[PDB]
Amino acid sequence: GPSVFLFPPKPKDTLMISRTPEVTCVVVDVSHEDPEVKFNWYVDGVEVHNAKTKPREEQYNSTYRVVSVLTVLHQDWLNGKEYKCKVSNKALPAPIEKTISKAKGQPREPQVYTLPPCRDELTKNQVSLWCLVKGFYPSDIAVEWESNGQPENNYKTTPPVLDSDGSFFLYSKLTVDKSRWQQGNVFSCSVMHEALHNHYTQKSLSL
Amino acid sequence: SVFLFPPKPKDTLMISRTPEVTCVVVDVSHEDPEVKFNWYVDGVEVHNAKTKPNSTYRVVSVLTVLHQDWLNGKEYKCKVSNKALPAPIEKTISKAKGQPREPQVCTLPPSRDELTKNQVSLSCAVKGFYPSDIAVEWESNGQPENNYKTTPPVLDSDGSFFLVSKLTVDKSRWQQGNVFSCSVMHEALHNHYTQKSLSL
Ligand SMILES: *[C@@H]1O[C@H](CO[C@@H]2O[C@@H](C)[C@@H](O)[C@@H](O)[C@@H]2O)[C@@H](O[C@@H]2O[C@H](CO)[C@@H](O[C@@H]3O[C@H](CO[C@@H]4O[C@H](CO)[C@@H](O)[C@H](O)[C@@H]4O[C@@H]4O[C@H](CO)[C@@H](O[C@@H]5O[C@H](CO)[C@H](O)[C@H](O)[C@H]5O)[C@H](O)[C@H]4NC(C)=O)[C@@H](O)[C@H](O[C@@H]4O[C@H](CO)[C@@H](O)[C@H](O)[C@@H]4O[C@@H]4O[C@H](CO)[C@@H](O)[C@H](O)[C@H]4NC(C)=O)[C@@H]3O)[C@H](O)[C@H]2NC(C)=O)[C@H](O)[C@H]1NC(C)=O
Ligand SMILES: *[C@@H]1O[C@H](CO[C@@H]2O[C@@H](C)[C@@H](O)[C@@H](O)[C@@H]2O)[C@@H](O[C@@H]2O[C@H](CO)[C@@H](O[C@@H]3O[C@H](CO)[C@@H](O)[C@H](O[C@@H]4O[C@H](CO)[C@@H](O)[C@H](O)[C@@H]4O[C@@H]4O[C@H](CO)[C@@H](O)[C@H](O)[C@H]4NC(C)=O)[C@@H]3O)[C@H](O)[C@H]2NC(C)=O)[C@H](O)[C@H]1NC(C)=O
């Protein structure tokens, strides 16, 4: 019989006024004999009528996959509203219902710290600046680097990791030329997270 | 359905620990219950696989791999055959091919703003390694440490990897000049080991 899986919005999308956060309801193992899927969508129980449902798509394994997408207000998501996806299909004994919302824990401001390059990489002509971000919850977060107003380029970030007290931490690594460090420039680690004031905080470093 | 798994890094890098794959077969019919295995290494056949002790049973099977075989990325041909299948189904496993690259290892002391908190966060940067198979741990005065978590390896723009491991200690302790130690194990190293250490 069909199964249903229900995905939340991407963290970057929840956290950013210019993006489009969506929950996505995917149904799979839909047969040829009972191919029609019907979706109903609810926000904290009230039916909504403007998800965008995609036509069915046959998969290499000869089952249909049918997907339905609902855009969520930024503030709804963040205020714990719950999104239910109800799926019907003749091959099911009864409709299947899944519900999703932000993680339910008590929210927790992350702590941001910046870290100078290792004293021993101070020779090789590229160095590494490290941003430690920790104690945050939920794990949905967004980290960037920047120098004098401008957004940086070559940095990479670890996913959040579950810490032993139930909170999360990650690190972000940023590579610049030795000479750019040594010239006393200011680098800045930005963190966007629901529990910070104005959903944003920033820490900087140099020599 | 057929899936083929790798050994757990410390197993393959240590001359005495025992490294082991797994061909886990899922979704075997109470209709067609019989399942026959055929693992080859490099397409030549051996038989010394073991076979582990809701709606179905998902039937296991365990092999040991020569340390040298797996470090030389031997191709661990798995082959499962049921009557519910069209052909015989076949997974195929190795460590990642490519030039092995040695990790660079780096300890970092707490941030100065963190000094004002109640416990400190000692950090271990580990970068430039390939393949991603690795193993990190913390010890102080030659004694296992417990309070440490470690990020997964993250892929870097030159195809190499990195991670950081954060060990969390009592505030007072760091200040009593204690030498604390990060230990890393990886194939590309001399002795598949290296310590690096830091203190006040
Ligand atoms: C026939 O094919 C079908 C389609 O498969 C394709 O075709 C075949 C031929 C083959 O080629 C496949 O490779 C092809 O993929 C098969 O459907 C698949 O079925 C399985 C189940 O049988 C599904 O498995 C689940 O998958 C998710 C992981 O979700 C996916 O990641 C996978 C793996 O990377 C990826 O392939 C999928 O596409 C999903 O990716 C995510 O999709 C979403 C939405 O599209 C993306 O989010 C959206 O992104 C947009 C951008 O595009 C926007 O940003 C938007 O905002 C956003 O919403 C998302 O980014 C994308 N992510 C990634 C990384 O790609 C697992 O979560 C899921 O959970 C598991 O559930 C198990 C029970 O089944 C359980 O055992 C596990 O614990 C686990 O987790 C639990 O599950 C609970 C409920 O059961 C949860 O409530 C609970 O939280 C959790 N609990 C615990 C304790 O952990 C499960 O693993 C698979 O997704 C299907 N694939 C697709 C593509 O639909 C079909 O099976 C097959 N049929 C037959 C008979 O063979
Ligand atoms: C009920 O049984 C469940 C499993 O058996 C099932 O039996 C039937 C009911 C039937 O429906 C059948 O289809 C099922 O097989 C138990 O639930 C859980 O099963 C989990 C799988 O969802 C299993 O997770 C494993 O995680 C371990 C890690 O410790 C891995 O060994 C392993 O690998 C992965 O496979 C998943 C597929 O879900 C994939 O998403 C992962 O990323 C990873 O490999 C990936 O494989 C796919 C190949 O298609 C690729 O797309 C990816 O690239 C690849 N990923 C990467 C990073 O390379 C397992 O999945 C759990 O062990 C198990 N749950 C628990 C809680 O133990 C269930 O336990 C049982 N119920 C009860 C009540 O006991």
From Swiss-Prot, chain B:
Entry's disease: Multiple myeloma: A malignant tumor of plasma cells usually arising in the bone marrow and characterized by diffuse involvement of the skeletal system, hyperglobulinemia, Bence-Jones proteinuria and anemia. Complications of multiple myeloma are bone pain, hypercalcemia, renal failure and spinal cord compression. The aberrant antibodies that are produced lead to impaired humoral immunity and patients have a high prevalence of infection. Amyloidosis may develop in some patients.
Organism domain of life: Eukaryota
Phylogenetic placement of the source organism: Eukaryota, Metazoa, Chordata, Craniata, Vertebrata
Region ranges (CH2): 1-97
Effect of L115M: In IMGT allele IGHG1*03
Protein's name in the database: Immunoglobulin heavy constant gamma 1
One of the GO biological process terms: adaptive immune response
A GO term, aspect molecular function: antigen binding
Gene from which the chain derives: IGHG1
Keyword Secreted attached: yes
Protein modification: Glycosylation on Asn-54 is required for interaction with Fc receptors and ability to activate the complement pathway. (Microbial infection) Deglycosylation on Asn-54 by S.pyogenes EndoS or Endos2 endoglucosidases prevents interaction between immunoglobulin-gamma (IgG) and Fc receptors, impairing ability to activate the complement pathway.
Residues carrying covalently attached carbohydrate according to the record: N54
Function: Constant region of immunoglobulin heavy chains. Immunoglobulins, also known as antibodies, are membrane-bound or secreted glycoproteins produced by B lymphocytes. In the recognition phase of humoral immunity, the membrane-bound immunoglobulins serve as receptors which, upon binding of a specific antigen, trigger the clonal expansion and differentiation of B lymphocytes into immunoglobulins-secreting plasma cells. Secreted immunoglobulins mediate the effector phase of humoral immunity, which results in the elimination of bound antigens.
Domain Ig-like positions: 1-94, 103-199
Region CH3, residue ranges: 98-200
Part of the full-length chain shown: 122 to 326 of 399
GO cellular component: blood microparticle; extracellular exosome; extracellular region; extracellular space; IgG immunoglobulin complex; immunoglobulin complex, circulating; plasma membrane
Effect of D113E: In IMGT allele IGHG1*03
Swiss-Prot/TrEMBL keywords: Adaptive immunity, Cell membrane, Chromosomal rearrangement, Disulfide bond, Glycoprotein, Immunity, Immunoglobulin, Immunoglobulin domain, Membrane, Secreted, Transmembrane, Transmembrane helix
